[PDB]
Amino acid sequence: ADNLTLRYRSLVYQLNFDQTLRNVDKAGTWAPRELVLVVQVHNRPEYLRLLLDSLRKAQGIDNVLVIFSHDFWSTEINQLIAGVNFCPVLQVFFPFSIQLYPNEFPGSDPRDCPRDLPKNAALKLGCINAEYPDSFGHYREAKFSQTKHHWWWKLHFVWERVKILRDYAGLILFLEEDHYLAPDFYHVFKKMWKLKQQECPECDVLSLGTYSASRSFYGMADKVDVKTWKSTEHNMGLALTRNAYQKLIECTDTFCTYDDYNWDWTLQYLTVSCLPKFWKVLVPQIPRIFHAPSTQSAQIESLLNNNKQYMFPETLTISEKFTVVAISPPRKNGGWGDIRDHELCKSYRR
Ligand SMILES: *[C@@H]1O[C@H](CO)[C@@H](O)[C@H](O)[C@H]1NC(C)=O
Ligand code: IUM
Ligand code: IUM
Ligand SMILES: [Cl-]
């Protein structure tokens, strides 16, 4: 196996097996505790760089394992992550990416149906997926399937295949290359988790914040709310317990067959149609994560620097408890009718 794609497949298989942990003396007593970060990484190094900047400036994370999950191999991306010398780092690699399979499924096989070919013409052509369009009559485009595959694959991989997380008793926080973390996020996370155990038994997940940030943190920087988890508000910096993970992975067949190419809309469907109880989320009133890039980077940093006096709250408080009602997705977005995507997505659990 000599050409470039096969070299990348060999590296991926070996590195996922070896799981080289950077910046820890494996002879010592270190083990991941309380919080692990998992970052979904595609191919936007300029955004990954901002995220790495925010982790470098974050307080108290010298011992927090950060796992980077890649579906694109590049020297630029690997070199950005190799420069991280300040916390434990693991890189893992999605083994079914378009980069590794360019001209066959889950990339683009020449025998695949064109996106808009009508069904009768598709059947007459005999193209591979002619009997399996999505709900709107459209046939698969590989690039819109990859994000959902990667997300489910790495969910299972970090909770079940990462050796250093064997018998891990903390939470795992899922974020992306184009997020930016507030410097007190770990401080706030630990108090949120304690408040969850004291006051929100029915909460299954934690969020580091929604997309709405107030200009002044006054009166709100120490407050957290209990809410129905809503994909459009709480998909950024989502922290899972082992219990939420176990319930999710038992919903593999539903997640992998539901006809929506968005991982987070599919999760919304699981909350009303597969999970034993719909998700309630504990979430701060002031976000500790932001969505990103120089201008947009300084815009994040200016907001944080105006509110220095409010960061690192000494105690967090839950706001008034209201009835919360489960939320279903208002429609299916399609893009996920191809039975090969269903089958591959389901195989990750094995
Ligand atoms: C490398 O070879 C494999 C099969 O031998 C093929 O699927 C792949 O597209 C090739 N890629 C390049 C860049 O040559
Ligand atoms: O953005 U450049 O390394
Ligand atoms: O890929 U971003 O949200
Ligand atoms: Cl985006």
Curated annotation (Swiss-Prot):
The species this protein was found in: Homo sapiens
Disorder association: Congenital disorder of glycosylation 2A: A multisystem disorder caused by a defect in glycoprotein biosynthesis and characterized by under-glycosylated serum glycoproteins. Congenital disorders of glycosylation result in a wide variety of clinical features, such as defects in the nervous system development, psychomotor retardation, dysmorphic features, hypotonia, coagulation disorders, and immunodeficiency. The broad spectrum of features reflects the critical role of N-glycoproteins during embryonic development, differentiation, and maintenance of cell functions.
GN (gene name): MGAT2
Effect of mutating D134A: Nearly abolishes catalytic activity
Record keywords, A-Z: Congenital disorder of glycosylation, Disease variant, Disulfide bond, Glycoprotein, Glycosyltransferase, Golgi apparatus, Manganese, Membrane, Metal-binding, Signal-anchor, Transferase, Transmembrane, Transmembrane helix
Effect recorded for D264A: Loss of catalytic activity
Outcome reported for the amino acid change (mutating S207F): In CDG2A; strongly reduced protein levels; loss of enzyme activity
Signal sequence region: none
Result of altering R115A: Strongly decreased catalytic activity and affinity for UDP-GlcNAc
Protein name per Swiss-Prot or TrEMBL: Alpha-1,6-mannosyl-glycoprotein 2-beta-N-acetylglucosaminyltransferase
A GO molecular-function descriptor: alpha-1,6-mannosylglycoprotein 2-beta-N-acetylglucosaminyltransferase activity
Stretches assigned to the Lumenal side: 1-350
Assembly notes: Homodimer.
Included stretch of the parent chain: 84 to 445 of 447
